[PDB]
Design a protein around this ligand. Structure first.
Ligand SMILES: Cn1nc(-c2ccc(Cl)cc2)cc1N
Ligand SMILES: [Cl-]
Ligand code: NA
Lengths: 306, 301
């Protein structure tokens, strides 16, 4: 029994984290086979960052300007190039700890584990959702750029996030590992803001199923509803639309608990319209939306990784 | 910026997890140097749930009754001994991945990470606190026994918890790595029930200091309190007493924020009285008690 916000075991990614220095700037890199990946903004001074020309800044650098430390060992940079907003540093040695891995770009609503790192050294691991507004509500201090986000699918690490910056509201923005930003953001010091965010409806539902599975059942009711009626309610409360695919994805949870997705939707309708009336669900007084359907099944079935 | 329930990176513990089988029972073991640690109830049969005599069950076992699998590899058991409620299986290979480590018994309110595992393989990592009633609010399925809790301090892993059982209320009980149970619990299936649980007041206060550090001040007020008046109020909300030790421990965070500890206590008293009135604090609509003073300083710097 029990239900916790849970990250993937982070060992396979810890073995890939290195320190990357360029001039006065230190941040983290991801060392896989013989390439170290990191944010291309590592090459900027504070004035460069105001309006960088990255290709120009880069051609003036050469390999020896990139100091890469793996633990206490130096790696030799033998090539450098950019792909979108990530720098790729070719090094003279493949990472003997390279896991089975893929670069995957995730969808808003999907969750992943962040391995927060400082000076190449892993400091903490936590679970994030990619918000509908393409930010993440991370926890990062200066030095954390280049920390990565990932999922594990059997024994394959799917890397999905590299940290690049913090926005003025204190939420975080970054790229996939091919350096495409999530969201309408750019790597430069200019005025940027998170858009208004919404709540991830299918995840809230998954979490209600998790609550039922763990014995927390007070919010269930005799009613059911339709997608169209419920989606009207979601719109009014700044919830994402629920699609048939979401209903399909929640299928197993509906068969297992005896609460149909639209039966649950009627519980959620009532919760949005009336609140919790002093009660909690799985220990929370607000509706949690950072567990996917897959997260809830995984944790309530005990799947493992090697 | 940001504030998250964050766990320690788990890789140093992952390379210590093994599967231990005795009879028809499989659970997890922790392999450090040439010893595998696991709950002694792995030797119980369905008859031995209620009043097992562990010394009598163990003397009947030989080394080869214990199967220990590390990844794909069988380890050879060359010795066994019991210490309190843990079994220590001596094996013929020292773990090459053994980290720097120590065994530390923690006090209620302390936090630690748990590497949940099944069949010797890690499932997930999350953050827990030792509740005042010596249980933990974990996430454990059948087959999770022998999963461990830990902190990591400058590459040294301090193992503080081994998972033994789930109580009827859904909360969890276990031992330190010397095999002594936290709280009044025993490894028998006889009805036992956790003390009424209470909120970890010193941690809530730390977390309110984290909220101020991250830019949030709406819940402060112009008042202060004596320590005794605070405790008189807070125990009516099932809050643990705040001690002068706790007041001292909050000294650094008070200094950093400029809010005296007893002034923060006054803000907490009002919050218990008023609720949050539809506001949130660090993204929560409840007061959070699973961050220690030390956690807050490490996460906020
Ligand atoms: C001088 N400077 N530069 C930044 C910045 C902005 C966006 C990105 Cl992606 C990376 C860094 C913040 C400050 N203070
Ligand atoms: Cl302690
Ligand atoms: Na219903």
């Amino acid at each position: 029994s029990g239900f916790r916000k849970m990250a993937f075991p982070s060992g396979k990614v810890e073995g890939c984290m290195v320190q990357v220095t360029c001039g006065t700037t230190t941040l983290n890199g991801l060392w896989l086979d013989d390439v170290v990946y990191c944010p291309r903004h590592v090459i900027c001074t504070s004035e460069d960052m105001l309006n960088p020309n990255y290709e120009d800044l880069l051609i003036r650098k050469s390999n020896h300007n990139f100091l890469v430390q793996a633990g206490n060992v130096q790696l030799r940079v033998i090539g450098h190039s950019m792909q979108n907003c990530v720098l790729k540093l070719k090094v003279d040695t493949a990472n003997p700890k390279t896991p089975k891995y893929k670069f995957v770009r995730i969808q808003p609503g999907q969750t992943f584990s962040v391995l927060a790192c400082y000076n190449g050294s892993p400091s903490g691991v936590y679970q994030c959702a990619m918000r509908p507004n393409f930010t993440i509500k991370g926890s990062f201090l200066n030095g954390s750029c280049g920390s990565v986000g990932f999922n594990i699918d059997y024994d394959c690490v799917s890397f999905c996030y590299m940290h690049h910056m913090e926005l003025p509201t204190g939420v975080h923005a970054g790229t996939d590992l091919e350096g495409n930003f999530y969201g309408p953001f750019v790597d430069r010091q200019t005025a940027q803001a998170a858009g208004t965010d919404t709540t991830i409806t299918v995840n809230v539902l998954a979490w209600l199923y998790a609550a039922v599975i763990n014995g927390d059942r007070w919010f269930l009711n005799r009613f059911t509803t339709t997608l169209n009626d419920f989606n009207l309610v979601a719109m009014k409360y700044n919830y994402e639309p629920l699609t048939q695919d979401h209903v399909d994805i929640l299928g197993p949870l509906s068969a297992q608990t005896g609460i149909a997705v639209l039966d649950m939707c009627a519980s959620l309708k009532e919760l949005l319209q009336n609140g919790m009336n002093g009660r909690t669900i799985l220990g929370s007084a607000l509706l949690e939306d950072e567990f996917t359907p897959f997260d809830v099944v995984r944790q309530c079935s005990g799947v493992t990784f090697q």
